[PDB]
Amino acid sequence: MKKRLAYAIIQFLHDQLRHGGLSSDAQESLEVAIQCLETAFGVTVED
């Protein structure tokens, strides 16, 4: 599995969640996606 690519994707999504100009519904979807990606790939982004 490509954990380092997954990590970078999670970084991008965290950024979109806060700064992407998405609707509140889209943000909710991204939050679940991030949790699911963290679980699937066994990574979380460092502080």
Add this chain to the structure above:
Amino acid sequence: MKKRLAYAIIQFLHDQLRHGGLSSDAQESLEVAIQCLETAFGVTVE
């Protein structure tokens, strides 16, 4: 451009779903993430 990157990411995640050497459980989690991203970014890949 953020949609275009989102699109590239969705394609990559679809590829990982099949090719990424995930457990059955991890693959389910990835499936949920893919649905969520497709919904959030308004792009769906078959």
